[PDB]
């Protein structure tokens, strides 16, 4: 039922100053916390108002840690760079994605931390928390040293333990907004394309949390065969929309339907023109 | 809260 | 301090086992090592310190974050192994590394 | 190889100045001063956690410090006193950043002040 996720990014900018380090910090789809390098204040800085009442001592360490992050990720660079013989004047990426996931009950079901290099898969703690999937052989060089400093460990720690409390204690925090389901306001439009073919655009709008599925089907069997499909598009409302459209012979529209199901629903809805 | 255990790949 | 040790010196006979003990203040602490100094010699790392007691060899070492000590066995002790060992603690990222005074051990033969 | 410390040892009159000098070809990013004194351990003099920072440890009266580059660091008496009489020790480390981070020493230099 309930996630939280660390995302970090890292822009070598050789010539140009030290490495972009951006880092974002989400309870399911919600985002609650950032850091900027090039911003002002050099701080995580609150992103929800339920993140605000954390005292001093948590700033501190949340910026401490971050810091921490920054310098990882800069070391990296040069270490990363160093292991494919590349060039000090080329502009790299590094990322960072780790959390948990809980169940409606919430307690651990799933911890991760996986970490690439120029947008490729580079490493990550498998499932059981305890190996790690080396994708090239310099990952591999990465993979002994985490194994001789017993990084995985130190993980399954931090994933099962002090991750999951405190996604509770901010799902317990903010309430008002975090535990809500907003169910999609879905409507239909109709658009002339040819002489002969009109398309069907079935509309999902303002919805949290963001996972949906909308399917067409003509009478009855499920057609992807003219379906297309925008990505779930964020509203800044804080919630969330999406569509889908099939094209149909002009006439026929009334063999088409829509299926839009939200956890916010009860039971799958459907439209139809 | 984020991790401690971030480490020089 | 953020670390206790005592100084002893212990007295083990060449052969028996030896165990050694730390406390430390700070439940948040994450990192823990073992340091081995001959006289007149510079600290050297024995070995890091985690809650999966990592046996290498003659020497075992345990983190217990529950009870806040850290331990450090070894077996079959040599001449070789008279020194001081000393507790060290990291807090976590960018906090200042603890040194405990040390405990010093003699092997008699 | 690893951290290198010259000289090892010194002799000084209160009054006189002197600066000791430590290496390191590790790659390290974090590098420490420390000094030794029976009954209680080492205590961090200053440290310099990177490249282009430094800053004071618990005992920093007395001593400075530059971090000439990434690979040396170097720590001065101004007017040597006979309480700085003790063993001084270089140390680095990939960096304090990171979690299990290993400190390598230097072989330390002992350093006497008379009158």
């Known amino acids: 039922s309930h996630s939280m996720r660390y995302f970090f990014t890292s822009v070598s900018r050789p010539g140009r100053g030290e490495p972009r380090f951006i880092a974002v910090g989400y309870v399911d789809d919600t985002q609650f916390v950032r850091f900027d390098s090039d911003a002002a204040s050099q701080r995580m800085e609150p992103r929800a108002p339920w993140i605000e009442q954390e005292g001093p001592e948590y700033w501190d360490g949340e910026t401490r840690k971050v810091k921490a992050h920054s310098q990882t990720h800069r070391v990296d660079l040069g270490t990363l760079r160093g292991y494919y013989n590349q060039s000090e004047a080329g502009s790299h990426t590094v990322q960072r994605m780790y959390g948990c996931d809980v169940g409606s009950d919430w307690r651990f079901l799933r911890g991760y931390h996986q970490y690439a290099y120029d947008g490729k898969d580079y490493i990550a703690l498998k499932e059981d928390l305890r190996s790690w999937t080396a994708a090239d052989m310099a990952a591999q060089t990465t993979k002994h040293k985490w194994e001789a400093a017993h990084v995985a460990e130190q993980l399954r720690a931090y994933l099962e333990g002090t991750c999951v409390e405190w996604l509770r204690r901010y799902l317990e925090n903010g309430k008002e907004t975090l535990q809500r389901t907003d169910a999609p306001k879905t409507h239909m439009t109709h658009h002339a394309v040819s002489d002969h073919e009109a398309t069907l655009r079935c509309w999902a709008l303002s919805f949290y949390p963001a996972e949906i599925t909308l399917t067409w089907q003509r009478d009855g069997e499920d057609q992807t065969q003219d379906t297309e499909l925008v990505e779930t598009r964020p509203a800044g409302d804080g919630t969330f929309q999406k569509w889908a459209a099939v094209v149909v012979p002009s006439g026929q529209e009334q063999r088409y339907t829509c299926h839009v199901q939200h956890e916010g629903l009860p039971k799958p809805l459907t439209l139809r023109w | 809260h984020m991790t401690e255990v971030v480490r020089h790949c | 301090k953020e670390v206790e040790q005592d100084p002893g010196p212990f007295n083990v006979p060449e052969g028996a086992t030896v165990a050694f003990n730390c406390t430390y203040s700070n439940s948040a602490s994450q990192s823990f090592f073992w340091y081995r100094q001959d006289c007149r010699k510079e600290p050297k790392l024995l070995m890091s310190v985690y809650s999966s007691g990592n046996e290498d060899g003659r020497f075992t070492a345990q983190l217990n974050r529950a009870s806040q000590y850290i331990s450090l066995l070894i077996r079959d002790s040599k001449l070789s192994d008279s020194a001081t060992y000393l507790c060290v603690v990291q807090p976590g990222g960018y906090q200042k590394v603890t040194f405990g005074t040390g405990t010093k051990l003699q092997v008699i033969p | 190889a690893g951290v290198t410390q010259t000289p090892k040892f010194q002799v000084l009159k209160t009054g006189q100045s002197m600066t000791l000098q430590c290496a390191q070809d590790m790659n390290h990013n974090s590098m420490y001063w420390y000094r030794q004194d029976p009954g209680m351990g080492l205590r961090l003099i200053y440290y310099?956690?990177?490249?282009?920072?430094?800053d004071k440890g618990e005992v920093p009266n007395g001593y400075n410090v530059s971090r000439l580059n990434k690979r040396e660091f170097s720590l001065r008496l101004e007017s040597a006193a006979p309480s700085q009489t003790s063993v001084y020790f270089c140390?680095?480390?990939?960096?304090?950043?990171?979690?299990?981070?290993?400190?390598?020493f230097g072989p330390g230099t002992r350093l006497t002040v008379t009158e």
């Open positions: 140390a680095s480390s990939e960096g304090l950043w990171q979690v299990g981070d290993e400190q390598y």
């Open positions: 310099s956690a990177s490249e282009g920072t430094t």
